[PDB]
Every structure is written in structure tokens, then in C-alpha cells.
Amino acid sequence: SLALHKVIMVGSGGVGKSALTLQFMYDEFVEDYEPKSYRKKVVLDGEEVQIDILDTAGFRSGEGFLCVFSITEMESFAATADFREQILRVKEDENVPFLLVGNKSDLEDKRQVSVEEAKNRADQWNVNYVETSAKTRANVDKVFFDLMREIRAR
Ligand SMILES: Nc1nc2c(ncn2[C@@H]2O[C@H](COP(=O)(O)OP(=O)(O)NP(=O)(O)O)[C@@H](O)[C@H]2O)c(=O)[nH]1
Ligand SMILES: [Mg+2]
Ligand SMILES: [Mg+2]
Numbered sequence: 001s002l003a004l005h006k007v008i009m010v011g012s013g014g015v016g017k018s019a020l021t022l023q024f025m026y027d028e029f030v031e032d033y034e035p036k037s038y039r040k041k042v043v044l045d046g047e048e049v050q051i052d053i054l055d056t057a058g059f060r061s062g063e064g065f066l067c068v069f070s071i072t073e074m075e076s077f078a079a080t081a082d083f084r085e086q087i088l089r090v091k092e093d094e095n096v097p098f099l100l101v102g103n104k105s106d107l108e109d110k111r112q113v114s115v116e117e118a119k120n121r122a123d124q125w126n127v128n129y130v131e132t133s134a135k136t137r138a139n140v141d142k143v144f145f146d147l148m149r150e151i152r153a154r
């Protein structure tokens with residue numbers, strides 16, 4: 001019986017929740033692909049564990065949350081506040097494993113949310129901010145592993 005870390009993908013429509021999930025799961029990225037709980041056995045810091053990712057459309061059983069927004073849409077960034085508030089209430093826990101993810105970092109020329117703005121919010125919530133790209137793979141494994149580490153340590 002291996003540890004099972006339950007991760008939940010949250011965020012506005014189109015931010016890349018599915019793309020991130022599929023890149024992490026199968027190392028595949030197909031632009032314009034609109035997809036089905038995904039499971040995968042991985043080694044976290046020397047320990048084989050199982051990660052379970054719930055990729056919902058833009059929640060109580062979840063142990064950790066990846067709060068995703070697109071750096072190219074400030075609207076999706078603004079929306080993270082509601083998602084944040086909703087998670088804490090439903091989960092009743094204020095220190096729930098949470099990570100703010102700014103996806104689509106490869107679309108820098110279309111950025112609407114600066115790194116400093118996102119970081120400010122992350123610091124305000126006492127969580128980390130990581131920018132990812134399902135397309136270039138940049139930091140995708142990092143956000144899932146980092147979140148599992150959060151879950152691992154309560
Ligand atoms: N260039 C680029 N495109 C991305 C990235 N992540 C996702 N996309 C693209 O953005 C679009 C929406 O991604 P998708 O994963 O479907 O978003 P979602 O958050 O899962 N949408 P929904 O909430 O409706 O389920 C797709 O055409 C996808 O290829 C990224 O990092 N870079
Ligand atoms: Mg999706
Ligand atoms: Mg960059």
C-alpha cells in the first residue's frame with residue numbers, strides 16, 4: 001500500500017488545467033486539444049508514491065490544490081481569489097496544501113499578469129508561486145511534486 005496524494009486542479013476555463021495534467025501524466029501536449037481522475041506512480045524524494053489528479057472543468061476529498069490561472073489573462077488571475085476562498089471554506093482548513101500556478105509562460109509576449117503581481121498575492125496567501133508551460137514542459141513536474149511535498153507534510 002503506497003501513499004496516495006490527492007491533487008485537485010482548479011482555475012478558470014482555458015487556463016490549462018487539462019494540458020498541465022496531460023503533460024505531467026503522459027508527456028504529451030497537443031495545442032487546441034479539449035479533453036475524461038488520473039493516477040500515476042512516481043518517486044517522491046526516494047519514496048514511491050501514487051498521485052491522483054482530479055482535472056475538473058473550470059473537491060472535498062482533495063488533499064492539495066493547484067490554483068491555476070493564465071499569465072495571458074488577468075481575468076483568470078482575478079478569479080483565483082474566489083477559488084481560494086471557496087477551497088478554504090469547503091475544506092474548512094486554512095492551511096490546506098495550495099500552490100498558485102501561472103500557466104502558459106511560453107506566451108510571454110501576451111502576458112497580462114506580471115510576476116511581481118502574482119508573487120504579491122502568493123505571499124499574501126503564504127503560498128508559493130510557480131510559472132509553468134504545458135507546451136515547453138517548464139516547471140510542470142515541479143508544481144505537482146512540490147504540491148505533493150506540501151501534502152506529505154500535513
Ligand atoms: N501555448 C500554450 N498553450 C497552452 C498551455 N496550456 C494550455 N494551453 C492551451 O490552452 C487551451 C486551453 O487549455 P486546457 O488545458 O483545455 O484548459 P482548461 O483549464 O483545462 N479548460 P476547461 O476548464 O474548460 O476544462 C488549449 O488550446 C491548450 O492547448 C501552455 O502552457 N502554453
Ligand atoms: Mg479542462
Ligand atoms: Mg518565462
